[PDB]
Amino acid sequence: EYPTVSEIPVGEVRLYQIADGVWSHIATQSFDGAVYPSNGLIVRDGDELLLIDTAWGAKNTAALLAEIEKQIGLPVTRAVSTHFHDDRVGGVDVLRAAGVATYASPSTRRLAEVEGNEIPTHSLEGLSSSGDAVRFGPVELFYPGAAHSTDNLVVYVPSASVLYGGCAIYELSRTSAGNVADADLAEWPTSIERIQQHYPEAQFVIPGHGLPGGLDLLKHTTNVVKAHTNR
Numbered sequence: 118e119y120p121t122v123s124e125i126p127v128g129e130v131r132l133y134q135i136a137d138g139v140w141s142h143i144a145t146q147s148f149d150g151a152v153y154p155s156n157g158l159i160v161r162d163g164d165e166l167l168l169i170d171t172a173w174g175a176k177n178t179a180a181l182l183a184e185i186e187k188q189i190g191l192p193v194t195r196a197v198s199t200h201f202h203d204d205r206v207g208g209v210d211v212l213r214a215a216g217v218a219t220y221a222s223p224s225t226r227r228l229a230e231v232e233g234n235e236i237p238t239h240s241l242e243g244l245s246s247s248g249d250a251v252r253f254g255p256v257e258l259f260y261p262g263a264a265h266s267t268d269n270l271v272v273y274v275p276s277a278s279v280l281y282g283g284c285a286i287y288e289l290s291r292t293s294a295g296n297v298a299d300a301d302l303a304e305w306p307t308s309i310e311r312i313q314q315h316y317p318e319a320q321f322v323i324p325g326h327g328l329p330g331g332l333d334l335l336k337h338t339t340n341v342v343k344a345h346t347n348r
């Protein structure tokens with residue numbers, strides 16, 4: 118069973134194997150009195166690991182590295198942050214001090230610097246235009262267009278048919294929008310459409326928060342976004 122927020126003390130990290138050589142990591146963080154679960158991804162690349170997104174803070178990200186060594190035992194050599202918010206880049210300095218090469222799009226690096234969030238060291242080129250895709254080792258990176266944020270990327274694992282949608286995709290159990298201060302409401306459903314059209318073969322779909330599912334998370338997200346648009 119997939120872990121939920123009441124099962125994870127803030128400061129601890131769970132791993133959940135999705136497929137051969139593909140895990141999610143789950144952590145929790147408090148914000149404005151409430152506690153929120155958050156996902157990232159781990160993809161085996163030969164005898165090293167590619168990390169997708171931090172565990173939302175320095176403390177959680179150190180625990181993330183320790184759980185990975187405990188349960189997997191392979192080195193995390195590169196990390197990709199899928200947008201500039203703290204649940205994606207919070208902990209980047211911990212990754213760098215551990216010798217992880219940290220990556221993000223120029224768009225994400227630029228926004229992180231303006232917000233005051235931690236800044237991934239390396240730039241991911243070739244992703245500035247909606248529909249752009251580039252290979253990054255064992256995954257494909259895809260920029261669907263602005264949605265939850267103007268810079269959000271999605272990540273696809275072709276060997277396992279795992280689509281990591283990040284925060285542009287909502288879990289089915291989430292029926293209201295949430296933190297859309299930085300969203301492009303007008304373009305969000307169009308960007309989701311681009312994800313559908315580019316990865317129709319996806320078997321598993323991982324949201325940035327909550328329970329994985331299939332491609333029906335995409336239509337669900339469109340519904341929730343349109344309802345918030347019509348407030």
Ligand SMILES: O=C(O)c1nccn1Cc1ccc(O)cc1
Pocket residue numbers: 153154204284291294295296297325326327
């Ligand atoms: O929406 C987001 O992307 C986000 N990032 C940090 C906090 N949130 C809001 C949230 C709301 C409900 C949840 O189950 C989980 C998260």
Ligand SMILES: [Zn+2]
Pocket residue numbers: 200202265266284
């Ligand atoms: Zn976000």
Ligand SMILES: [Zn+2]
Pocket residue numbers: 202204284325326
């Ligand atoms: Zn988020």
Ligand SMILES: [Zn+2]
Pocket residue numbers: 289336337338340
């Ligand atoms: Zn729904």
